[PDB]
Amino acid sequence: SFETRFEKMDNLLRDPKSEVNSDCLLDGLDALVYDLDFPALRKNKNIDNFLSRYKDTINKIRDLRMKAEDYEVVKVIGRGAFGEVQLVRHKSTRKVYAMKLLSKFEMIKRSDSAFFWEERDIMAFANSPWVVQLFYAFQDDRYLYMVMEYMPGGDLVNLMSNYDVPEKWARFYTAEVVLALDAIHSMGFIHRDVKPDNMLLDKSGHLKLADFGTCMKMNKEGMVRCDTAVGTPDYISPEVLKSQGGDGYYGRECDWWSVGVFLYEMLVGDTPFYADSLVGTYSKIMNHKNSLTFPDDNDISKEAKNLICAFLTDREVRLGRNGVEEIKRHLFFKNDQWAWETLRDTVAPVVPDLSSDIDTSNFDDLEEDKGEEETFPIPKAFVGNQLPFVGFTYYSNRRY
Amino acid sequence: MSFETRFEKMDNLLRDPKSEVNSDCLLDGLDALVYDLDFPALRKNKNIDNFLSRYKDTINKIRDLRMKAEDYEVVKVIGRGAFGEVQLVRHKSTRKVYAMKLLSKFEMIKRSDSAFFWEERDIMAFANSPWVVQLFYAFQDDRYLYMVMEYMPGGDLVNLMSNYDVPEKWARFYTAEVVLALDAIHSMGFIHRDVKPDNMLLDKSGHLKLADFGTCMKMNKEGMVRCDTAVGTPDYISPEVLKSQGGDGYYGRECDWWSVGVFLYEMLVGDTPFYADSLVGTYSKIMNHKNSLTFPDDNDISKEAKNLICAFLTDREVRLGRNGVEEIKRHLFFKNDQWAWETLRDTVAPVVPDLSSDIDTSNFDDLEEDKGEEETFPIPKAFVGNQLPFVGFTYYSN
Ligand SMILES: O=S(=O)(c1cccc2cnccc12)N1CCCNCC1
Numbered sequence: 001s002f003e004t005r006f007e008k009m010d011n012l013l014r015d016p017k018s019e020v021n022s023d024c025l026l027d028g029l030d031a032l033v034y035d036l037d038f039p040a041l042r043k044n045k046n047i048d049n050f051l052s053r054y055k056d057t058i059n060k061i062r063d064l065r066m067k068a069e070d071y072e073v074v075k076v077i078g079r080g081a082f083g084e085v086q087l088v089r090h091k092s093t094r095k096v097y098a099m100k101l102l103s104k105f106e107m108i109k110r111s112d113s114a115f116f117w118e119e120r121d122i123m124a125f126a127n128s129p130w131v132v133q134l135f136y137a138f139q140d141d142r143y144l145y146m147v148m149e150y151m152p153g154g155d156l157v158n159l160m161s162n163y164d165v166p167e168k169w170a171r172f173y174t175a176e177v178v179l180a181l182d183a184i185h186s187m188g189f190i191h192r193d194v195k196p197d198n199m200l201l202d203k204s205g206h207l208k209l210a211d212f213g214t215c216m217k218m219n220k221e222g223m224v225r226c227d228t229a230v231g232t233p234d235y236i237s238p239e240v241l242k243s244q245g246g247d248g249y250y251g252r253e254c255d256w257w258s259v260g261v262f263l264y265e266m267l268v269g270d271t272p273f274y275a276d277s278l279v280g281t282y283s284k285i286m287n288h289k290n291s292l293t294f295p296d297d298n299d300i301s302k303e304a305k306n307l308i309c310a311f312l313t314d315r316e317v318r319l320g321r322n323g324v325e326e327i328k329r330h331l332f333f334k335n336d337q338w339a340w341e342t343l344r345d346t347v348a349p350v351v352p353d354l355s356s357d358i359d360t361s362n363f364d365d366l367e368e369d370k371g372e373e374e375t376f377p378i379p380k381a382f383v384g385n386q387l388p389f390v391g392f393t394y395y396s397n398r399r400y
Numbered sequence: 401m402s403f404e405t406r407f408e409k410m411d412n413l414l415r416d417p418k419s420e421v422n423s424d425c426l427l428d429g430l431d432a433l434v435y436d437l438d439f440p441a442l443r444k445n446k447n448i449d450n451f452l453s454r455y456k457d458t459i460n461k462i463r464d465l466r467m468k469a470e471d472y473e474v475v476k477v478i479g480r481g482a483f484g485e486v487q488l489v490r491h492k493s494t495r496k497v498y499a500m501k502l503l504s505k506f507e508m509i510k511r512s513d514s515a516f517f518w519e520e521r522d523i524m525a526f527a528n529s530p531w532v533v534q535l536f537y538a539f540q541d542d543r544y545l546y547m548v549m550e551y552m553p554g555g556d557l558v559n560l561m562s563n564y565d566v567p568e569k570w571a572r573f574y575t576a577e578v579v580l581a582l583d584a585i586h587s588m589g590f591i592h593r594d595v596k597p598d599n600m601l602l603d604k605s606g607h608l609k610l611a612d613f614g615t616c617m618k619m620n621k622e623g624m625v626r627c628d629t630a631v632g633t634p635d636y637i638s639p640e641v642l643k644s645q646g647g648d649g650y651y652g653r654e655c656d657w658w659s660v661g662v663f664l665y666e667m668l669v670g671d672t673p674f675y676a677d678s679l680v681g682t683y684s685k686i687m688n689h690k691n692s693l694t695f696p697d698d699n700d701i702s703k704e705a706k707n708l709i710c711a712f713l714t715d716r717e718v719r720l721g722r723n724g725v726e727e728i729k730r731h732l733f734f735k736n737d738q739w740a741w742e743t744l745r746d747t748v749a750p751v752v753p754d755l756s757s758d759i760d761t762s763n764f765d766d767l768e769e770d771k772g773e774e775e776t777f778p779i780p781k782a783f784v785g786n787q788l789p790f791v792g793f794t795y796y797s798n
């Protein structure tokens with residue numbers, strides 16, 4: 001029908017998940033002009049003509065659309081390959097955020113994943129108090145930007161370095177993590193990289209997961225097929241580690257194993273598979289059956305040792321293989337301070353005391369500035385480097 | 401501007417028809433970027449092979465959903481030449497009759513001239529004047545631009561003049577409607593440059609409208625328009641536009657009035673005042689208009705008619721209409737007791753077409769067969785971008 005058509009087309013233009021919404025189209029055009037405006041390319045009439053036709057237009061667009069200079073960088077609060085994360089204040093709204101920058105070039109400079117789609121998707125649509133929230137995603141010719149909510153409480157790595165974590169606390173966090181992961185699993189993802197670095201605390205001291213660059217959609221059997229291991233040395237599960245071209249087919253248990261590693265570390269202060277060198281940790285992980293030993297410390301409760309072991313074991317017998325409910329029913333969690341379904345409503349073990357909306361006391365210092373890093377080389381022929389990053393923008397068609 | 405402002409100015413830009421970034425335009429940019437990239441040679445680049453593999457599913461569905469050629473049933477061709485054929489079409493779904501124009505993307509690309517259509521699209525889509533043929537839909541594909549306009553069943557003035565020995569009363573009426581039409585086009589800030597009987601069409605009521613505006617241009621600060629472009633059929637073209645072969649020339653709107661003069665002479669005489677066997681012949685006689693312009697020894701043509709024709713057919717500097725349209729309207733030739741300017745298009749036309757059906761083409765000559773195998777673009781080894789000149793042409797009405 002002539003009506004049905006105008007409508008479907010209207011929906012494809014609106015839907016916050018359509019590959020051709022205003023966000024995708026404005027991006028598509030923005031990408032083109034960006035990937036054409038080079039003297040070597042302008043030699044071609046069409047290109048030159050087109051660009052002059054859209055010169056005034058494209059410029060007005062880039063001034064109306066969300067851009068980097070719309071934010072006042074309060075301070076850098078995290079770095080990594082592919083880019084950094086900075087405490088920013090939106091110049092116009094005065095609203096404070098944690099904006100994540102991603103070097104378009106760096107990711108293109110061998111990253112073999114396009115990981116950022118998962119992260120954009122999850123943080124933008126999860127709508128879970130366990131997931132860091134993405135408010136805006138925009139880009140330019142050099143960086144991807146992810147305007148997320150700021151977690152003033154800092155990460156769990158920082159917390160652990162400042163306190164000798166008592167069981168009560170360890171229980172609380174392990175519990176919030178378990179609920180957080182369960183929520184991510186519910187969205188149909190295996191996290192694959194559960195670690196204290198990605199565990200952040202809000203202004204109330206409650207946990208949220210950030211950084212989902214390793215998340216991968218589970219199949220109908222609830223499994224994942226991967227020939228190359230992903231994650232972190234200390235926390236990678238024996239199966240994700242051994243994952244080979246021979247198959248590489250594991251379930252969500254790999255996350256629970258990591259939770260065990262997480263628990264062991266809070267109580268002990270060391271990782272269950274620490275070694276002189278990374279490669280040592282590798283051997284100790286595969287040999288978990290023998291390498292998993294607790295130091296002679298009379299303070300790790302029976303239950304704690306039990307759960308840690310229930311997690312740090314071969315997938316087939318690992319606690320969690322039979323849904324999250326069997327983890328929750330473990331004795332280690334048995335307490336008289338909270339119940340699972342109301343946990344994030346109980347008072348946290350460490351509540352941050354913040355001086356201002358931009359208080360970064362719970363984040364280690366970092367240099368700032370650096371000096372504009374090298375990006376793509378000026379094209380001699382049409383390369384189209386902005387094409388892989390079309391539709392990343394989350395601004396014109398976001399969900400409400 | 402607040403964040404709310406900025407956000408909304410942008411969100412409205414996506415919905416404005418008069419916007420180059422409207423959703424339709426943007427959808428072109430993508431639709432196009434798929435065509436001028438989906439070549440085995442270009443697939444080598446991953447950013448391309450990936451970009452295309454991602455939008456394959458989507459882009460196809462899009463092209464099928466949007467307004468496409470096979471949405472129209474071609475009733476009969478009613479005009480050809482230029483870069484395509486004007487055909488009588490009935491919308492398959494709405495069952496509405498339209499005059500659809502086609503423009504070979506390749507043909508334009510081939511012989512430069514791939515920018516004229518912007519003016520025509522704009523004027524016919526936004527003029528909103530009864531003196532202008534209306535553009536309802538403008539869509540495209542990889543090969544043709546399409547301009548779904550309103551059908552003018554009364555045919556053109558060329559046809560009318562070939563069937564009647566135009567009397568003065570009639571000549572006056574049409575000259576008057578042309579004058580009003582052009583003035584309206586001038587009001588939008590355009591110099592027409594190509595006023596001729598071919599583009600003068602009559603509606604079902606026998607009233608004039610201008611079609612084909614692919615020669616109009618925006619008047620600069622002082623109301624002029626420089627230009628350098630070859631000239632086809634100079635019969636109606638003015639001395640200034642002619643002496644402007646190469647950009648070495650700025651002319652006013654009075655170039656259109658000269659054409660109106662040519663128009664009037666032809667209706668009353670039956671031939672163009674500067675006709676010659678060759679194009680260069682006509683051109684020469686046009687330049688030597690101070691001497692070449694003669695009237696036959698049959699004083700059928702009235703005093704006023706001879707005056708106006710001469711008032712138009714003269715050097716720009718002294719040409720009638722250099723002091724606004726009002727001095728043309730006040731000419732005696734138009735002095736009559738049948739109509740007044742401000743109500744002219746409300747008076748009964750000298751020739752009202754009698755139509756048999758909504759698809760009656762009796763007032764249009766049968767056209768030949770093209771037999772043409774419209775050449776196609778060659779497979780590019782790099783990025784040619786033969787779609788970029790036609791990006792933002794797509795236009796829909798509400
Ligand atoms: O800056 S973060 O990358 C970071 C990522 C994502 C969202 C964030 C929200 N607020 C603060 C920091 C955030 N981060 C802080 C210290 C370094 N460890 C990783 C967590």
Ligand SMILES: O=S(=O)(c1cccc2cnccc12)N1CCCNCC1
Pocket residue numbers: 478479480486499501533549550551552553555556598599601611612764
């Ligand atoms: O068919 S047309 O091309 C034509 C052009 C533009 C709009 C039209 C609208 N209705 C009918 C014919 C139309 N045309 C009549 C015959 C040949 N002379 C040129 C004008």
